[PDB]
C-alpha cells in the first residue's frame, strides 16, 4: 500500500503534473490526486478507453504488453497502467 503510494508520489513528484491516478475499470480510481467528481469521471473514461484498447490489442496481438499504454498527448501524457489486480492512469506531463 504505502510502497505503491510512495511510488506513485515519486513518479508524480515532477512539478506541474496534471494527475497520476492508480485507477480501475469500475469508474473509480485506486489512488488519485484530483477533484473527486473529475477523478471518478476520468476513471470511468479511462475504463472505457482501457476496454477499447484491450479489444484493439486482442484484435492486433492478444499477447502484447497489456499492462500499460500511455497517451502522450500534448494536453496530458495520460500514462494508463492497468495492472492485473488494480489499474493506473497517470495523466502526466510531456517533460519528466
Amino acid at each position: 500500500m504505502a510502497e505503491v503510494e510512495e511510488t506513485l508520489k515519486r513518479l508524480q513528484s515532477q512539478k506541474g503534473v496534471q494527475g497520476i491516478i492508480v485507477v480501475n475499470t469500475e469508474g473509480i480510481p485506486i489512488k488519485s490526486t484530483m477533484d473527486n467528481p473529475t477523478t471518478t469521471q476520468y476513471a470511468s473514461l479511462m475504463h472505457s478507453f482501457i476496454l477499447k484498447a484491450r479489444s484493439t490489442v486482442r484484435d492486433i496481438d492478444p499477447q502484447n504488453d497489456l499492462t500499460f499504454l500511455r497517451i502522450r498527448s500534448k494536453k496530458n501524457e495520460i500514462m494508463v497502467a492497468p495492472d492485473k489486480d488494480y489499474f493506473l492512469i497517470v495523466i502526466q506531463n510531456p517533460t519528466e
Binding site: 500500500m1 510502497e3 505503491v4 503510494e5 511510488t7 506513485l8 515519486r10 513518479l11 515532477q14 492508480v22 473509480i28 480510481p29 485506486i30 489512488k31 499492462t67 500499460f68 500511455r70 502522450r72 500534448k74 501524457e77 500514462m79 497502467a81 495492472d83 492485473k84 489486480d85 488494480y86 493506473l88 497517470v90 502526466q92 510531456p94 517533460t95 519528466e96
Partner: protein, 429 residues
C-alpha cells in the same frame, strides 16, 4: 476506501505497482519534449572549452535523501550484467538513527532518476557493497557488525535474504570488504574481516562457508585485512592491506595458505589496493597500485620487496585510488580533499595527469570508475556520487601504449636502480 486499501496492500497488486513504477521511470526519463534540438551546433561552446579537461566532467549526481543522511559511500563497484547503474553504499545512518544503519541505494546512469531501481536495507551499517556479475538478481554486502548478507535487487525485500550467521568460526569481527570471486564453475565469494578471515565460502550456504581461515603471517602475526587484491585468475595468489601498515601477498590454495609474501613499502595503514587494472600485451601481475592513509599513494611490486614507485602528492591522509580499467598508464586517485588526481604513468608520471579538484574536501571513501570506464564514480561525505566522465583527453589508450607502458616500466626500474646506486654512493666513510 476498504477495497482500494486492500488492493494497494495486496502483495501481487503492490508488486505489479512497483513494476509499473519501474516502467514509469523507464518512460519518464526517456520522454523528451517535441521540438527538442539535436543539430549539434550548440556544442561550439562545449567543444571550445573542452581543450582544458575533456577527460574530466561530471555526468549526474545520482544521490538520494531518504538513505544519505550523513552516510558516505562505503563502497563502489559498477555493474556488469546490467551496467546501466551503480551502487551507493551509504554509511551508518548516524544522522537518522531511527532508520536502519544500512540503507544501500543504487545510483543511476541510464535514467535521470534520483531514486534507485532497487534497495538493500541492512540492520547494521553496510561495510562493503558488491554487485554480482554472475548473479543478475541480487547484490553482495557486508555489515559493519560483520554479517555478509544479500538483499535482492529483483525481488521485493530490501532486508537481507540470507545473512551470514554470527558464528564463532565466522567473521565475528567487522567484515571489512569482500570480493565477488569465483566463476560459474566454482563460485567462492571470498571475504575479509577486521580480524581478516578469508571466508572462501560457497554460493548457497550463507551460514556454512566452503572455506574459512583467520589469516596470519610474519611469524603468525594476525593481520587486519584493509583490502583484498589478487591477480585476475590466480585463485591461490592474492594481495592484502594491513591496518598496522604492511601489505602482504597472500596464497589461498596450497599448504602455505595465507599471506605468503609481504611487500611492505608504505608508512601506515593501507587505504586501497587495486591490482593491475589494465594489462595490455605486457603482464603487469608483478606489480600493483596501493593507497595508504600516510599521505602517499604507493606502487608496490609483487616481485620487489620494497615498493616500486611512490606518488606522494597527498598533503594529508589519502582516501582511495585505483588504476584505470582501460588505460594502463591512467590510475585514478582520491584523497580527503576530493582531489580527483588520476595520473597516467606512460603520459604524465610526476604530476597527476588528470587533476580534478572538487572544493570543500568532498569526503571520498572509495573512487571507482565504470566497468567500461566512461565515468569515474566517487562520493563525498553526504553521498553525492559525482560521476566525472572520463573523456578522450586521457581516455584514449594508444596502440603501442601497452608496449610503451612496458618500456616506461623498464625505464622506471632502471631509474630506481640508478637512484639506489646514488644512495649507495651517498653513504659516507
Amino acid at each position: 476506501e476498504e477495497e482500494k486499501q486492500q488492493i494497494l496492500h495486496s502483495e501481487e497488486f503492490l508488486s505489479f505497482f512497483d513494476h509499473s513504477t519501474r516502467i514509469v521511470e523507464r518512460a519518464l526519463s526517456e520522454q523528451i519534449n517535441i521540438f527538442f534540438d539535436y543539430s549539434g551546433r550548440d556544442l561550439e561552446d562545449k567543444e571550445g572549452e573542452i581543450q582544458a579537461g575533456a577527460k574530466l566532467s561530471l555526468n549526474r549526481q545520482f544521490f538520494d535523501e531518504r538513505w544519505s543522511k550523513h552516510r558516505v559511500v562505503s563502497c563502489l563497484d559498477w555493474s556488469s550484467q546490467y551496467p546501466e547503474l551503480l551502487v551507493a553504499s551509504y554509511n551508518n545512518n548516524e544522522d537518522a538513527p531511527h532508520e536502519p544503519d544500512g540503507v544501500a541505494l543504487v545510483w543511476n546512469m541510464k535514467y535521470k532518476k534520483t531514486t534507485p531501481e532497487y534497495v538493500f536495507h541492512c540492520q547494521s551499517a553496510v561495510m562493503s557493497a558488491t554487485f554480482a556479475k554472475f548473479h543478475p538478481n541480487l547484490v553482495v554486502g557486508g555489515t559493519y557488525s560483520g554479517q555478509i548478507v544479500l538483499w535482492d535487487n529483483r525481488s521485493n525485500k530490501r532486508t537481507p535474504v540470507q545473512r551470514t550467521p554470527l558464528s564463532a568460526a565466522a567473521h565475528t569481527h567487522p567484515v571489512y570488504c569482500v570480493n565477488v570471486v569465483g566463476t560459474q564453475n566454482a563460485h567462492n565469494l571470498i571475504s575479509i574481516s577486521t580480524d581478516g578471515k578469508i571466508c572462501s565460502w560457497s554460493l548457497d550456504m550463507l551460514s556454512h562457508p566452503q572455506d574459512s581461515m583467520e589469516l596470519v603471517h610474519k611469524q603468525s602475526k594476525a593481520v587486519a585485512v584493509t583490502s583484498m587484491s589478487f591477480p585476475v585468475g590466480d585463485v591461490n595468489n592474492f594481495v592484502v592491506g594491513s591496518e598496522e601498515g604492511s601489505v602482504y601477498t597472500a596464497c589461498r590454495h596450497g599448504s602455505k595458505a595465507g599471506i605468503s609474501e609481504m611487500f611492505e613499502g608504505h608508512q601506515g595503514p593501507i587505504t586501497g589496493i587495486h591490482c593491475h587494472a589494465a594489462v595490455g600485451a605486457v603482464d603487469f601481475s608483478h606489480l600493483f597500485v596501493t593507497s595508504s592513509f600516510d599521505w602517499t599513494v604507493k606502487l608496490w611490486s609483487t616481485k620487489n620487496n620494497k615498493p616500486l614507485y611512490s606518488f606522494e602528492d597527498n598533503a594529508g591522509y589519502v582516501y582511495d585510488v585505483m588504476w584505470s580499467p582501460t588505460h594502463p598508464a591512467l590510475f585514478a586517485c582520491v584523497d580527503g580533499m576530493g582531489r580527483l588526481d588520476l595520473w597516467n604513468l606512460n603520459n604524465d608520471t610526476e604530476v597527476p595527469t588528470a587533476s580534478i579538484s572538487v572544493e570543500g574536501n568532498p569526503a571520498l571513501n572509495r573512487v571507482r570508475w565504470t566497468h567500461s570506464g566512461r565515468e569515474i564514480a566517487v562520493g563525498d561525505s553526504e553521498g553525492q556520487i559525482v560521476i566525472y566522465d572520463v573523456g578522450e583527453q586521457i581516455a584514449v589508450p594508444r596502440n603501442d601504449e601497452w608496449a610503451r607502458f612496458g618500456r616506461t616500466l623498464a625505464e622506471i626500474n632502471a631509474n630506481r636502480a640508478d637512484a639506489e646506486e646514488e644512495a649507495a654512493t651517498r653513504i659516507p666513510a
